[PDB]
Design a binder for this molecule. Structure first.
Ligand SMILES: */C=C\c1nc(Nc2ccc(S(N)(=O)=O)cc2)nc2nc[nH]c12
Ligand SMILES: [Cl-]
Ligand SMILES: [Cl-]
Ligand code: NA
Length: 248
């Protein structure tokens, strides 16, 4: 309830809108994080949109989505603290960086676990970048939360639509990058990037990965959203087994 009930261990990152801090609850020593949002220049209405959003997020309870726990208002002042689950495994961006540095591609089994658990998280969301996807202590996957929009789908750069299938395209880019350690479409300019995305061509993921995994990732990257598989069709794939799901 009160910021004074927690000790800040350290800053994890200073992403958009403020900081991400690893904190500890004094009462029982529970490790959490909170996000710092400067309500400073908001409106009596802007604050209302924020409150609606925070209520919505308080609604969600899914093992593959970072869990909301509490909100805290400061009086010294102008700061809203959104208290959330801490994911001890870090983010996928760091996994990819490590694979690069070690010259070591990621296990297919790990990619299949990310595919399964992120697809389930999206399914729940339906009633995305590596730095927004976290791992817990068992390498379970948790969806959380100027730059090149590497994952922008074709229809959304033609302003056509933003639907479930656009999410599927983004998941395709993420899994592709997990496999290749590079996004499917790269470019120095955003116009060049747009051309590459529109063309829809990319290299096969490395040959150490199964044809079946390549096939599903490629299908998610289809130029036509109606040729991309739904979450249900993804989860029906024979590649996806019990042990790829979350386990406490
Ligand atoms: C602000 C992000 C955040 N981070 C975590 N866990 C976490 C992230 C990054 C590392 S790292 N780069 O040092 O290996 C370790 C742990 N958990 C969060 N839950 C909500 N927001 C979170
Ligand atoms: Cl490599
Ligand atoms: Cl290749
Ligand atoms: Na770590």
């Amino acid at each position: 309830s009160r910021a004074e009930d927690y000790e800040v261990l350290y800053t994890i990152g200073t992403g958009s809108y403020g900081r991400c801090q690893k904190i500890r609850r004094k009462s029982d020593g529970k490790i959490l994080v909170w996000k710092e949002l400067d309500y400073g220049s908001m409106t009596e209405a802007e604050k209302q949109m924020l409150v609606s959003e925070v209520n919505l997020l308080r609604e969600l309870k899914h093992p593959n989505i970072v869990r909301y726990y509490d909100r805290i208002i400061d009086r010294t002042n102008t700061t809203l603290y959104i208290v959330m689950e801490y994911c001890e495994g870090g983010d996928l961006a760091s996994v990819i960086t490590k694979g690069t540095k070690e010259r070591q591609y990621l296990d297919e089994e790990f990619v299949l676990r990310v595919m399964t658990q992120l697809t389930l998280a999206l399914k729940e969301c339906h009633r995305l970048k590596p730095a927004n996807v976290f791992l817990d202590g068992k390498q379970n996957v948790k969806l959380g939360d100027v730059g090149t929009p590497y994952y922008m789908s074709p229809e959304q750069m033609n302003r056509m639509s933003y639907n479930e299938k656009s999410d599927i395209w983004s998941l395709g880019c993420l899994l592709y990058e997990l496999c290749a350690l590079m996004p499917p479409f790269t470019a120095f300019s955003q116009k060049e990037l747009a051309g590459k995305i529109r063309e829809g061509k990319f290299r096969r993921i490395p040959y150490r990965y199964s044809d079946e995994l390549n096939e599903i990732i490629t299908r998610m990257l289809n130029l036509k959203d109606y040729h991309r598989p739904s979450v249900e069709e993804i989860l029906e794939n024979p590649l996806i087994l019990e042990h790829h799901h979350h386990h406490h």
